[PDB]
Amino acid sequence: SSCSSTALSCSNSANSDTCCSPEYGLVVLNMQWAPGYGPDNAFTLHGLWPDKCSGAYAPSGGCDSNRASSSIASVIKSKDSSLYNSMLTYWPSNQGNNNVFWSHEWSKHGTCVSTYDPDCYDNYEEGEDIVDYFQKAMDLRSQYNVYKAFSSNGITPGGTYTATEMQSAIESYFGAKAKIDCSSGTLSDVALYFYVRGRDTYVITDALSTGSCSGDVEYPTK
């Protein structure tokens, strides 16, 4: 009875049961501002990537080949219609091929979250782990609203802002530095770094890099 909840990944208190404390203890939530994809008032998801505590990446081919998949859109569609519909809105592939995008994120990163290993479920049915993972990430993109962090500090779409004011809004709103990346001086992605308390309560921590945005950054309308 229990999954030891004060356990914090990357600390002297992580319990060795990889079903109750993630093996890749440092996780980054990568969200992007792609014009033409998702709501006007929201960053959409790129992925939830588990990393080593030193920030080193996990195996580039994922961590469970037997669990890799190139059919993630029909697996989610059949296990959960609502989760499939939310993903079309909040996790669109900015390259017009959702199934290849979601299959890559599941295979390379999803297999590396040990709390969703099938041996952790006391009564497992196929596809349980996949839905837990896509749902945990969607929830985090919702709960960590970067668009609200910027607007509340007067940074809205369709303006030129300084990278410096952008970091203060993320820093003051969430209490941690994020990795803000630009492409040709236009904002493109924002990533938030985390630690896990117990099985899956994310605790934010400072990004291990402030990112490529520097100077005046354009924040376009979607």
Side-chain angles (χ1 to χ4, degrees):
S1 289
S2 196
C3 242
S4 326
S5 226
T6 58
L8 187 103
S9 64
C10 303
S11 81
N12 305 312
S13 25
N15 69 286
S16 0
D17 175 10
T18 47
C19 280
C20 285
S21 193
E23 182 181 19
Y24 288 91
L26 174 68
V27 202
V28 356
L29 182 73
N30 189 283
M31 283 150 351
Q32 65 193 207
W33 190 256
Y37 298 95
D40 284 52
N41 68 349
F43 280 67
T44 54
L45 225 29
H46 177 174
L48 183 59
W49 306 340
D51 291 330
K52 289 293 207 81
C53 286
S54 65
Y57 300 136
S60 54
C63 311
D64 196 328
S65 311
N66 280 126
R67 277 165 76 231
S69 187
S70 43
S71 293
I72 289 309
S74 36
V75 177
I76 294 181
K77 229 179 300 190
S78 72
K79 242 261 183 196
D80 188 352
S81 45
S82 291
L83 179 55
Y84 178 74
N85 288 336
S86 299
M87 284 179 63
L88 293 190
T89 295
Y90 293 110
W91 210 325
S93 171
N94 70 65
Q95 265 172 65
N97 196 305
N98 291 338
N99 184 69
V100 171
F101 185 42
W102 300 331
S103 290
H104 171 84
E105 294 299 328
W106 166 254
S107 292
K108 263 61 179 200
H109 301 295
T111 50
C112 297
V113 178
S114 50
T115 58
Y116 303 135
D117 180 346
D119 284 337
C120 306
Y121 296 91
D122 71 291
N123 262 282
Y124 180 91
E125 22 182 76
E126 34 145 346
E128 221 174 325
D129 50 329
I130 288 167
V131 179
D132 272 27
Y133 174 71
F134 279 99
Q135 185 64 73
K136 203 19 163 277
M138 285 288 299
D139 281 5
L140 302 173
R141 186 216 92 263
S142 244
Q143 182 202 173
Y144 286 90
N145 191 343
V146 160
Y147 176 88
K148 174 59 174 242
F150 284 158
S151 66
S152 116
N153 283 293
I155 297 169
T156 47
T160 300
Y161 302 99
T162 198
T164 343
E165 70 186 287
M166 268 171 78
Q167 190 63 260
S168 329
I170 296 310
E171 274 199 67
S172 58
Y173 203 82
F174 296 112
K177 302 207 193 316
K179 185 173 174 303
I180 309 178
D181 295 290
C182 285
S183 91
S184 282
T186 307
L187 165 76
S188 59
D189 325 288
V190 175
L192 295 182
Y193 290 59
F194 295 91
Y195 284 129
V196 187
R197 177 138 65 230
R199 195 189 110 111
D200 52 19
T201 298
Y202 289 57
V203 166
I204 191 163
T205 191
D206 295 278
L208 276 52
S209 186
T210 38
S212 45
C213 292
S214 65
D216 320 276
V217 184
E218 172 175 330
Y219 184 12
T221 50
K222 196 76 96 67

